[PDB]
């Protein structure tokens, strides 16, 4: 099959948050059937980033999800042709991130071409002031609507010292060919970072994702 037990990852993100432009490139690897992946990210333009890196990390591929045999796998079926996704993250203080990604496959490597725009973040809020400390673990509700797969998360962005900000995710995942469509289900995520310098010039992200009925 085209999705091997061990796959590699290359990515590029072009982004703009509150007007600040940047480029990030990443290289990594994962185990698509185990639902695990890791990516090493480097800021290539725009360093040091003047905002929270956590609003970028979930943009850095549901092909890396453990799926039970009885739930059709929208993402793995889409290959070799691939899929793309479009996501809106709405923050409780009216900040908003819109991000899109195109996921393709070259040999044994997934390639992500990502574009991200963040706007309307309060200038002295925790995002622009770099006061976040990662994401909680989460549950994404997956469901078919208008012939494509949608995912919703009621997420929590953790704040240094205490508490969190609520962030709603709405994602549309679009296979590039017809695939067998799943019934509604859940994907449980845990995204984490290795300890990093506050400049965030180099960051390693890890994610685990498991689907369940």
CB of 56 to Cu ion, least distance (A): 10
60 binds Cu ion (CB under 5 A): no
- For β-strands 164-175 and 20-31, DSSP reports them as unpaired
CB of 160 to Cu ion, least distance (A): 10
Helix or strand (DSSP H, E) at 66: none
Residue 46 vs 172, nearer CB to Cu ion? 46
Residue 76 vs 189, nearer CB to Cu ion? 76
162 binds Cu ion (CB under 5 A): no
CB of 199 to Cu ion, least distance (A): 10
1 binds Cu ion (CB under 5 A): yes
CB of 201 to Cu ion, least distance (A): 11
- For β-strands 109-119 and 132-135, DSSP reports them as unpaired
Q: Give the burial string for 162-201 (b: 16+ CB within 10 Å, else e).
A: eebbebebebbbebeeebeebeebbbbbebebeeeeeebb
Q: Convert residues 16-55 into a mask of x (bound to Cu ion by CB under 5 A) and - (unbound).
A: -------------------------------------x--
Cβ-contact 169, 153 below 8 angstroms: yes
CB of 57 to Cu ion, least distance (A): 8
Binding residue count for Cu ion, defined by CB under 5 A? 2
Q: Six-digit token pair at 163?
A: 């508490």
Residue 32 vs 35, nearer CB to Cu ion? 32
Tokens 């092909």, residue? Answer: 63
**Residues whose CB is less than 8 angstroms from the CB of residue 7 and which lie 6 or more positions away in sequence, other chains included:** 29, 30, 31, 32, 63, 64, 108, 109, 110
* Residues at the contact surface with Cu ion, assessed by CB under 5 A: 1, 53
């Amino acid at each position: 099959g085209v999705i091997k037990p061990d796959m590699k990852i290359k990515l590029k993100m072009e982004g703009n948050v509150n007007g600040y432009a940047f480029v990030i490139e990443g290289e990594g690897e994962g185990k698509p059937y185990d639902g695990t992946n890791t990516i090493n990210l480097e800021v290539k333009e725009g360093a040091p980033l003047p905002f929270s890196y956590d609003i970028l990390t979930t943009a850095f591929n549901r092909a890396f999800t453990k799926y039970p045999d009885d739930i059709p796998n929208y993402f793995k079926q889409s290959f070799p042709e691939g899929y793309s996704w479009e996501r809106t993250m709405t923050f409780e203080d009216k900040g908003i991130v819109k991000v899109k990604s195109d996921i393709s496959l070259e040999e044994d490597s997934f390639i992500y071409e990502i574009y991200l725009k963040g706007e309307n973040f309060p200038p002295n809020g925790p995002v622009m002031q770099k006061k976040t400390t990662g994401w909680d673990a989460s549950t994404e509700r997956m469901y078919v609507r208008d012939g494509v797969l949608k995912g919703d998360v009621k997420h929590k962005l953790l704040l240094e010292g205490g508490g969190y900000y609520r962030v709603d995710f709405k994602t549309i995942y679009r296979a590039k060919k017809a695939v067998k469509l799943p019934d509604y289900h859940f994907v449980d995520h845990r995204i984490e970072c290795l300890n990093h310098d506050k400049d965030h010039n180099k960051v390693t992200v890890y994610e685990s994702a498991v689907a369940r009925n």
